Design a protein around this ligand. Structure first.
Ligand SMILES: [Ca+2]
Ligand SMILES: [Zn+2]
Length: 392
């Protein structure tokens, strides 16, 4: 029973690109196909957001808001001044004008997109105090995203999200490995990193930072520049927010809204040793993560940061423990799924035996029925009721 008709909006993580990009190879489906199309085909209106993969959740949230209702992206004057990037970014037609007219949406987010979705909701409802103050004080204008009072989001579903960050960021060679992961994902799309394609192919959307791939520059080369850029060296980055300390900081202000349903899906593609207590990558995990990231994730302990044995189980990219919802520096409630989806709390939907990329189809896994997974999910979302009544 379909209790609602709101559309679904897909939101990628630290890798991701629009439907026209990457020669049509979809982030949402990868080698499996087109998740969006599947859903639409089954009666579930579905759209796709594309925002800065490497940008800070804040940056992304602003981009998302503009992309959704239309308009010129406004990163906030206080923010922009604080971090040293442009206040105004690209312009968007707007995907869903129904939003300004009282319609709502369901957001389905992968990886870091989960952090972004949460933030979007928080800003939409509550705005930003810092933002508002600075405006009043300096006589500058404010985006409605900073004011609050919106009623746009019915639910948020996160999949393989580092709510509490990912120890991946602690690798000695994280900078280089992280970009190799981007190269990996290009590779998946049948796209080379040593070729100076004239077409855009994969736009990092770094307009605020004044960065873009140049004529004659390969992705390898471009990445070499990015590594030394503010989108990697500043705190206003995905790098920072993805870290354990960064995620905590974000958790301190990004709270679950009582007017919104939250569903959390975890992922794991590992086994435990006996002699070590470490977690190891399972056969089938994506090649990149199996060699380069999983070993580390499955063995990295840090008493100070709070990284114990609980954090070892991983999906090749994110520690499973981080995925059920924000906990580090968080007041949000998390409840194990009991058949009943509850509002204003993290409905912990459990852990699935799929890797970070398999779950979106970017890496194959013939044993994972992806279509069924998204379809079951869509039905869940579409079943969500406006309100409830106590009963025995
Ligand atoms: Ca696989
Ligand atoms: Zn910023």
């Amino acid at each position: 029973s379909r209790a609602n008709d709101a559309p679904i909006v897909l939101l990628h993580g630290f890798t991701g690109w629009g439907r026209e990009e990457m020669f049509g190879f979809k982030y949402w489906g990868g080698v499996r196909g087109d998740i969006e199309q599947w859903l639409n085909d089954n009666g579930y209106r579905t759209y796709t957001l594309a925002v800065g993969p490497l940008s800070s959740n804040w940056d992304r949230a602003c981009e998302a808001y503009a992309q959704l209702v239309g308009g010129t992206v406004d990163y906030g004057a206080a923010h922009a001044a604080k971090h040293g990037h442009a206040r105004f970014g690209r312009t968007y037609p707007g995907l869903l004008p129904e939003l300004k007219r009282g319609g709502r949406i369901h957001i389905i987010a992968h990886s870091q997109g989960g952090q972004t979705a949460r933030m979007l909701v928080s800003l939409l409802e509550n705005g930003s105090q810092e933002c508002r103050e600075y405006a009043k004080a300096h006589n500058v204008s404010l985006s409605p995203l900073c004011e609050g009072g919106h009623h746009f989001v019915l639910s948020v579903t996160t999949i393989a999200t580092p709510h509490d960050g990912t120890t991946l960021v602690n690798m000695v060679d994280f900078t280089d490995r992280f970009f190799d992961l981007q190269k990996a994902v290009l590779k998946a799309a049948a796209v080379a990193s040593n070729v100076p394609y004239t077409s855009q192919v994969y736009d990092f959307k770094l307009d605020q930072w004044g960065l873009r791939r140049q004529p004659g520059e390969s992705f390898d080369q471009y990445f070499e520049r990015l590594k030394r850029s503010p989108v990697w060296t500043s705190t206003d980055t995905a790098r920072y927010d993805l870290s354990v300390p960064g995620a905590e900081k974000l958790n301190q202000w990004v709270k679950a809204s009582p007017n919104t349903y939250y569903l959390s899906f975890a992922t794991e593609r590992t086994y435990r040793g006996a002699l070590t207590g470490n977690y190891y990558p399972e056969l089938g995990m994506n090649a990149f993560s199996a060699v380069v990231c999983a070993p580390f994730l499955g063995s990295y302990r840090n008493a100070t940061l709070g990284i114990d044995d609980r954090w070892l189980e991983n999906d090749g990219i994110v520690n499973a423990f981080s995925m059920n919802g924000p906990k580090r520096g968080s007041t949000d409630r998390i409840v194990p799924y009991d058949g009943t989806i509850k509002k204003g709390v993290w409905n912990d939907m459990g852990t699935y035996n799929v890797d970070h990329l398999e779950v979106i189809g970017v890496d194959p896994n013939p044993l994972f029925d992806i279509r069924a997974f998204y379809l079951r999910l869509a039905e869940q979302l579409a079943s969500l009721q406006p309100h409830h009544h106590h009963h025995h």
